[PDB]
Amino acid sequence: QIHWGNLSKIGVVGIGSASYKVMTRSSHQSLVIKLMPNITLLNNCTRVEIAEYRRLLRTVLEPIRDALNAMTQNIRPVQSV
Amino acid sequence: QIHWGNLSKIGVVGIGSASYKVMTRSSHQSLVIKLMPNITLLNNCTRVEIAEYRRLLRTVLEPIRDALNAMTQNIRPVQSV
Amino acid sequence: QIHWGNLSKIGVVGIGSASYKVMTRSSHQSLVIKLMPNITLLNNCTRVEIAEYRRLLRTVLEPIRDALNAMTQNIRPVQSV
Amino acid sequence: GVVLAGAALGVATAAQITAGIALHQSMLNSQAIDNLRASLETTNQAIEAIRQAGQEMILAVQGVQDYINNELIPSMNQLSCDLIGQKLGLKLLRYYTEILSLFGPSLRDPISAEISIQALSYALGGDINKVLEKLGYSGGDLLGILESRGIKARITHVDTESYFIVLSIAYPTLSEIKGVIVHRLEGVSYNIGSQEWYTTVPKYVATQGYLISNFDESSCTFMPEGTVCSQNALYPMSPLLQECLRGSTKSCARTLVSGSFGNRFILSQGNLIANCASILCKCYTTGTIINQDPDKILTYIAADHCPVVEVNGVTIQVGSRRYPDAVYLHRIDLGPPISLERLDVGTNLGNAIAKLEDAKELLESSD
Amino acid sequence: GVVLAGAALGVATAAQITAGIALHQSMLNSQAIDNLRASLETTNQAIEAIRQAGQEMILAVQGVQDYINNELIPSMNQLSCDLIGQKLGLKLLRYYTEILSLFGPSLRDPISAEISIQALSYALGGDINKVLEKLGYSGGDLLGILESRGIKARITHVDTESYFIVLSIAYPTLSEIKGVIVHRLEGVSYNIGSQEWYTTVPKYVATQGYLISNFDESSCTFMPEGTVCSQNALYPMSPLLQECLRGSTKSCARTLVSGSFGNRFILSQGNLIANCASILCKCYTTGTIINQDPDKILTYIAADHCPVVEVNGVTIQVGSRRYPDAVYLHRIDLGPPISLERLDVGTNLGNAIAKLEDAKELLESSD
Amino acid sequence: GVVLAGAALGVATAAQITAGIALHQSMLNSQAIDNLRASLETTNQAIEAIRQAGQEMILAVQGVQDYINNELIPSMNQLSCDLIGQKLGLKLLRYYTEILSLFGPSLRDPISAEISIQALSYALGGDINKVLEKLGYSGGDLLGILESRGIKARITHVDTESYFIVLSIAYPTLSEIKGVIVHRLEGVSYNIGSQEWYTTVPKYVATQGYLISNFDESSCTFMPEGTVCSQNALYPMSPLLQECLRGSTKSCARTLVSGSFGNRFILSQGNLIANCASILCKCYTTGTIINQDPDKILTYIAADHCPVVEVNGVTIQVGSRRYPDAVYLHRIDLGPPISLERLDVGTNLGNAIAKLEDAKELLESSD
Numbered sequence A, B, C: 001q002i003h004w005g006n007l008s009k010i011g012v013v014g015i016g017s018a019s020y021k022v023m024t025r026s027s028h029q030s031l032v033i034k035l036m037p038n039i040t041l042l043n044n045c046t047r048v049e050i051a052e053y054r055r056l057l058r059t060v061l062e063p064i065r066d067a068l069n070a071m072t073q074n075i076r077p078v079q080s081v
Numbered sequence D, E, F: 001g002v003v004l005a006g007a008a009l010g011v012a013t014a015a016q017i018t019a020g021i022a023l024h025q026s027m028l029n030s031q032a033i034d035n036l037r038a039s040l041e042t043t044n045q046a047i048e049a050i051r052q053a054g055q056e057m058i059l060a061v062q063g064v065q066d067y068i069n070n071e072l073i074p075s076m077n078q079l080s081c082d083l084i085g086q087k088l089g090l091k092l093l094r095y096y097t098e099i100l101s102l103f104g105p106s107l108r109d110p111i112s113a114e115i116s117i118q119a120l121s122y123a124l125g126g127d128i129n130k131v132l133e134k135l136g137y138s139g140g141d142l143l144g145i146l147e148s149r150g151i152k153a154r155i156t157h158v159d160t161e162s163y164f165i166v167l168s169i170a171y172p173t174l175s176e177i178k179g180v181i182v183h184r185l186e187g188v189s190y191n192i193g194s195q196e197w198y199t200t201v202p203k204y205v206a207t208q209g210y211l212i213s214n215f216d217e218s219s220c221t222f223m224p225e226g227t228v229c230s231q232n233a234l235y236p237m238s239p240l241l242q243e244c245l246r247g248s249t250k251s252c253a254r255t256l257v258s259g260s261f262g263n264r265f266i267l268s269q270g271n272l273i274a275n276c277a278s279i280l281c282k283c284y285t286t287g288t289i290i291n292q293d294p295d296k297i298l299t300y301i302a303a304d305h306c307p308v309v310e311v312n313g314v315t316i317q318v319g320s321r322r323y324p325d326a327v328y329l330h331r332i333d334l335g336p337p338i339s340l341e342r343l344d345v346g347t348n349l350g351n352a353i354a355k356l357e358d359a360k361e362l363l364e365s366s367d
C-alpha cells in the first residue's frame, strides 16, 4: 500500500508500525459525589460556612436536575403508544 | 435567510436558535494587591524570607512601573499645546 | 526589504523592530529526583503507605530504565569494529 | 481634557492610546496613593474594603494572609522560630512564582493588558468568591455568575516602595443585539453506495439582516433565554459558504465520516431524519423494516407513515410530517468533496496552483 | 421497553437520544435514592463503598472529608471555634469553585456529556488513585493504568434536597482492529542547490485494506505491542495525499526547512540516509569523506561501501544495503512547494481564485 | 570515541541518535551511581547539593521532604500513628500522580525527550526557585530569569533499586543573530463604501538578508533590547506573501472586520493614520471636522494641516508629516478578499478545484 521505495527517494521513511486498539466501554458502576460533608465532630463551628456553601451549590445543581428531568419525562413505557 | 429545506436534503438541520447578548464593561472599581503581608505576630521569625521575597518582587515590579510612567508622562493637560 | 510606503497605503505599519536572540544550551549539570523520602523520624507510622507508593512507582520506572538500556547497549567503544 | 503627546511617543496602537487615556482618568491621585499606602500598612486581613470618606472604597487583597493568620500565628508558641520562617518561605516562593507568571515578561503590554478575574485567582489567595461577594455578586443566579467571571482588570499603579499593585475593574452587563440570531447546525451522514458522507457546515452560524456570519462560541454560554458572550463572537463568512446555507447545495462541501460511523439519525421538528442505509430502521407500529431506496440518500420518517419508529435500536414516537418524502439523489446537486486537515489543504492547493499555471500557458498558445 | 416522545421533545441529536435512553436504564430507582440518601447521611469517610444487599455497590466520595478528619477534627480543642469555621470555609469555597467549573454553565449538555475521571479529580478530593483502587485497578501494569484513566462518567441524578450527584461510569477494554496498521513517518531534508527542502507528510498514517487514512495520535499511547487509543483516531485522507504515499512523488508537497536546519540524516533498516550536502559525511573505515553528487539529493550509506560512517560527528556502523544508490534528481519528479501556515494558505488561495476567474473569461472569448 | 551499532538498532531518528550518544557521555559512571545511592540514603533535606570531591556536584531534590519535615515530624507526639500515615499517604498518591503524568506512558521517547524545568515543578516539590538559586540564578534581572526558565532536562538514569531519576540539564545563553530583524506589523481598517476592510498580514515577520520570513512568537519575549526566544522562531514564508510585504499591494489579501469594528486609527512616526469614514476625526486646533474623501480609503494626519487632532474622542498632538496625503483608491491595486476560517478555506478550495477541472476540459476541446 505505502510505496516505501519512492518515498525514500524524497527523504521519507517509516520508523515503526503498530496494530491499532481502541477503547470500548462496557458494564456500569455508580459513583456518588457527596457534596455535604459530615461535620458533627466540629460542633457547629462551621454552621455559617456550611449554610453559605449549600446556597452556592443550589444555583449550580438546580439547572442540571431540571435538564435531566426534561429528558426522562419524555421517556415512557412501550404501551403508552 | 437560511434555506432549511435544501439543507435538510443533504442532512443538515438547525437544532436551536438564540438571541445574542455580548458583555459590555461599565463603571469602575479599584482593586489593590497588597504584596507585603502583615507579619508582626510572627516576631521576626520570617525576616530572612521576607527580605528575599521583597528582592525577588522588585525585579518584576520595576519594569511595569516604568512602562506605566512612559505612557502617563506623554499625557498632558489640554493647554500645553 | 519591507516596502513601508505601499503597505501604509493599505493600512499596514510597522510598530517596532528588534534584534533576534535565540537560546543555546551549553555545559551540563546533574539533577537527581530522590523518589524515596527519609521517614525515620516517623517511626514506622507510614510503612504501609511507603510500600504501596514504591509499588506504584515501579510500574512507571521499569519501562524508562529499559528504554535507556536498549539504547546504551548499542553504543560501544570505537575498536569493536 | 488631556492630550497625548504623539510626536514624543511616536508610535502606539489604538488599544494603547485608549488604555493610556483611561489610565490617566482611572489612576489614583498622587496623594490618594499616600493614603492607601498608610491604610495598607496597618491592616492584617486577607481581604479588606478600605473606606476613606470622600474617596471611593478600595478593595485590598493579601495573597498569603489567610495562611499567616490561620496556620502560622496559632503555631507561634508551639513551633520553633526557624520552622515558622521556613513554612512561610515556601508560601512566599510559590506566591512570587504566580506574580512572575502573571506580571512578568510574559505580559507583553502592561498598559493595555486586560487580566480576567479568574487569571488573578492565585494572586488573590487562590479563590475569587470572597472578592466577588464584597463587590455585591451573590452567586444566586447563573447570569450574575457569568458576568462576575467576565470581569477584567487593568493595571493603574505599581508601587515599588511599598510593594502593591493597583488594578481597575469594570462591571460587565448584557447588551442584547436583537437583530442577530445564533443558530446551531447539526448534520447526519448520508450514503452514496457504501460510502458514508456528511455535509461540512459550521457548528454555529449567525444571521444578521442580509448577512450570514461565522460564530465563535469560545466565549459564549448558551443560556435558556439567549447566548451570552463575554467577547465579540461574530466574524465574516465567505460568500460561497453563505450561498451554501442559503440553499445552493452545490456550494456546500462534503467529506467522508471519520472512524467507523457518523451521526446517522436525528430528531428534528418531531420527525426522524435517518440514514437507513447505515442502520436498521423499522416501524414499530406495523413491525415492518424501513428500507432506504438506493437512489435516495436519506429517509424522512413521520407519523403519516409510521407513528412509532425504531432506529438503531431506539424506539421513538414521531409527529406529523414536517419534511417531504426523500427525493432522488439525481435531483440533488452535491458539492465538492474536501478534507479540512491542514496538510491535505496545503497539498491539494499546491497541486491546484500547478495545474492552473499549466492551464494558464496553453490558453495563451491556442488563443 | 421504553419509547422516546419525539413529538413532545421535538428536536434532539442521536447522542442526546441514546444518552437519554441510557439515562433511563442506568439511573437509580426512585427508592434506591431514598436508601442512598440515608446511607450518605450516616457516613464520615472521604471514600466509601456503600453496599446494600440486593442492590449494587455504590461508590461514595466526599471532597473535603479528608481535610475535616485529618486536619480539623484533631484541632478541635486547640483552635477557636471561629478559626475552625474559617479554615473549613476556605476549603468549601475552593471546592465550590471546582463544582462550578465542571458542572456549571460551561457544561453544555448534561444529558450526553461524558466527563473523564481525570477531570473529576478535584471533585473527588484532588486525586483519583484510591477511587480506582476501590474499583479493582492495581496500578501494576501500564495498560490497566491507561484503561483506568480512560473511564468516563455520565450524570444520572442530581439531588437538590441532600446535595449529591450520581454518576455512571463504564470500564474501558481494548478492541483490536487487526486490519488497521498505524505507521510513523519521518523525513530527512534534501538539497537542491543551497536550498534545503523536505517532503510534507503526516507524522502518523494508517493503512486499512485499500485505504490510506489520516491518524489523530492525540488520544493514543504507543505501547510496545500496539497503539492504544481511548477514542477513534482514524479520519479520511485526500486522494492526492494517498497517491503521494502510494509512490506518486509528484503528488507529495515540499517546503523549505524552518530555522537553520532540518533532520539531515536518519538510521533506517540498518542504513544511513543522509543529506551529505548539508553535513560532513565521512567513512570512518577508510578515512575518506563522502561527497554528495550535486545532481543527487541524498546519500544512502550501507556497509557494501562503508561499514562505519561518520555523520555530523556521530560514528555509526551500518548493515548491508537496503536502499539503492541515490538516483539523479532528474529521474525524480518533485511535487509542488507549499507553506502550511494559515495566512500563506489563505493568501495564495485568494490569488489562485483570482487567476482562475481571469482564466475562465478568456477561454470563453477564444472558444 | 564510541560507535552506534546501527545494524543492531536498525532504525533511529537523528534526535534519538544524538541524544543516545549524549546519554553515553553524560550518564554517571557505574560506581558514581553506588556513591550517589549511598549519599541519597543518608540525607533528609528537600534539596541538597551532594558534593563528593573529585566528582561534580549533584543536586538532589526530594518532593515530599518539606512536608514530612515541616508538618509531619513536629506532630509526631500529638497525632496518632495511623493519622500520620494517612496524612503522608495523601501526599504520596498526589506525588505519584505527577510522576505518572510526566514520566509515564505519555512520555513518548525517554531518550530524546527534553523536559522543561517548569514542567518538573511538581516533581521537585511544587516550586523551582530554590533549585535555580542553588544553581547560581539570582532572580536579579529579567534576562537571567528567562534563561533560568529555558532550562531543559534529559533523563540519564532511572534507578529501580533505590527509586531515583538522574537528569542532565544544560544552561541557556543568548545567541544573537545580528542579520535577523523581527518586525511587529499592525493594521488599521479602511473603508470601501460602507464595507470596512483590513489587510491580512502576520503579526510578526522577520527580515534576513534577501529573505522575508514568518516568525513564531510563541517562545519569545520582547525585551527592551531584543527579542529573546528559547526556540527557533523563524520559518518559511510563501513568495506571494513576501511580495506583498515588498510592496505588491495586489499580492496582499484582505478581509472584512470582525464584530462591529476594527482598529480604526494608529499613531505611527508621530502621525495619525485613521479611517475617518468609520470614526469622527476633527482638528482640535481649528475646530473643524476632518472628512475622508469618499474615493480615498484612509487619512494621514500630520501637523502641517492639524497640530492637534481629535480622533474617536481622544486628542493627540502630532508631528511633521511622515506619510503622503492619501491617494485615490483608484491608484491602489487591492488584493483578493479571503477568509482564514478553516471551513471557508476548505469549501472555497473544493470549489476552485472543481472550476479548474471544468476549465481543464474545455481548453482541450477548443485547442
Ligand SMILES: *[C@@H]1O[C@H](CO)[C@@H](O[C@@H]2O[C@H](CO)[C@@H](O)[C@H](O)[C@H]2NC(C)=O)[C@H](O)[C@H]1NC(C)=O
Pocket: B003, B006, D246, D247, D248, D249, D250, D330, D331, D332, D333, D334
Ligand atoms: C435547492 O437545490 C437545488 C440543487 O440541488 C437547486 O437547483 C439548481 O438550481 C440551479 C440554478 O439556480 C440550476 O442550474 C440547477 O440545474 C438546479 N439543480 C437541480 C438538481 O435542480 C435549487 O435552486 C436550490 N434551491 C434554492 C432556493 O437555492
Ligand SMILES: *[C@@H]1O[C@H](CO)[C@@H](O[C@@H]2O[C@H](CO)[C@@H](O)[C@H](O)[C@H]2NC(C)=O)[C@H](O)[C@H]1NC(C)=O
Pocket: A003, A006, E246, E247, E248, E249, E250, E330, E331, E332, E333, E334
Ligand atoms: C516513482 O516515482 C516516479 C516519479 O519520480 C514515477 O515515474 C513517473 O510516472 C509517470 C506515470 O506514472 C510518468 O508519466 C512520469 O514520466 C514518470 N516520471 C519519471 C521521472 O520517471 C513512478 O511511477 C513512481 N513509481 C510508482 C509505483 O508510483
Ligand SMILES: *[C@@H]1O[C@H](CO)[C@@H](O[C@@H]2O[C@H](CO)[C@@H](O)[C@H](O)[C@H]2NC(C)=O)[C@H](O)[C@H]1NC(C)=O
Pocket: C003, C006, F246, F247, F248, F249, F250, F330, F331, F332, F333, F334
Ligand atoms: C506600489 O503599489 C502599486 C499598486 O497599488 C504598484 O503599481 C503597480 O505596478 C504594476 C507593475 O509592477 C503595474 O502593472 C500596475 O499597473 C501598477 N498599479 C498601479 C495602480 O499603479 C507599485 O508597483 C507598487 N510599488 C512597489 C515598489 O511595488
Ligand SMILES: NC(=O)c1ccc([N+](=O)[O-])cc1NC(=O)Cc1ccccc1
Pocket: D236, D237, D238, D239, E345, E346, E347, E349, E350, E353, F255, F256, F337, F338, F339, F340, F344, F345, F348
Ligand atoms: N470572494 C469575496 O467576495 C469575499 C468577500 C468577503 C470576504 N470576507 O471574509 O470578508 C471573503 C471573500 N472571499 C472568500 O472568503 C473566498 C476565500 C476563502 C478562503 C481563502 C481565500 C478566498
Ligand SMILES: NC(=O)c1ccc([N+](=O)[O-])cc1NC(=O)Cc1ccccc1
Pocket: D255, D256, D337, D338, D339, D340, D344, D345, D348, E236, E237, E238, E239, F345, F346, F347, F349, F350, F353
Ligand atoms: N477529491 C475527492 O474525491 C475526495 C474524496 C474524499 C475526500 N474525503 O476527505 O473524504 C476528499 C476528497 N478531496 C479532497 O480532499 C481534495 C481537497 C482537499 C482539501 C480541500 C479541498 C479539497
Ligand SMILES: NC(=O)c1ccc([N+](=O)[O-])cc1NC(=O)Cc1ccccc1
Pocket: D345, D346, D347, D349, D350, D353, E255, E256, E337, E338, E339, E340, E344, E345, E348, F236, F237, F238, F239
Ligand atoms: N511557490 C514557491 O515557489 C514556494 C517556495 C518555497 C515555499 N516554502 O514555503 O518554502 C513555498 C512556496 N509556495 C507557496 O507557499 C504557495 C502555497 C502556499 C500554501 C499552500 C500551497 C502553496
Ligand SMILES: *[C@@H]1O[C@H](CO)[C@@H](O)[C@H](O)[C@H]1NC(C)=O
Pocket: B038, B039, B040, D041, D042, D043, D044
Ligand atoms: C499589623 O497588624 C496589626 C494588628 O492587626 C496592626 O495593629 C498593625 O498596624 C499592623 N502592623 C504593621 C507593622 O504593619
Ligand SMILES: *[C@@H]1O[C@H](CO)[C@@H](O)[C@H](O)[C@H]1NC(C)=O
Pocket: A038, A039, A040, E041, E042, E043, E044
Ligand atoms: C457523621 O459521622 C458520625 C460518626 O461517623 C456518624 O455516627 C453519624 O451518623 C454522622 N452524623 C451525621 C449528622 O450525619
Ligand SMILES: *[C@@H]1O[C@H](CO)[C@@H](O)[C@H](O)[C@H]1NC(C)=O
Pocket: C038, C039, C040, F041, F042, F043, F044
Ligand atoms: C534520615 O535522616 C537522618 C537524619 O538526617 C540521617 O541520619 C539518616 O542517615 C537517614 N536515615 C535513613 C534510614 O535513611
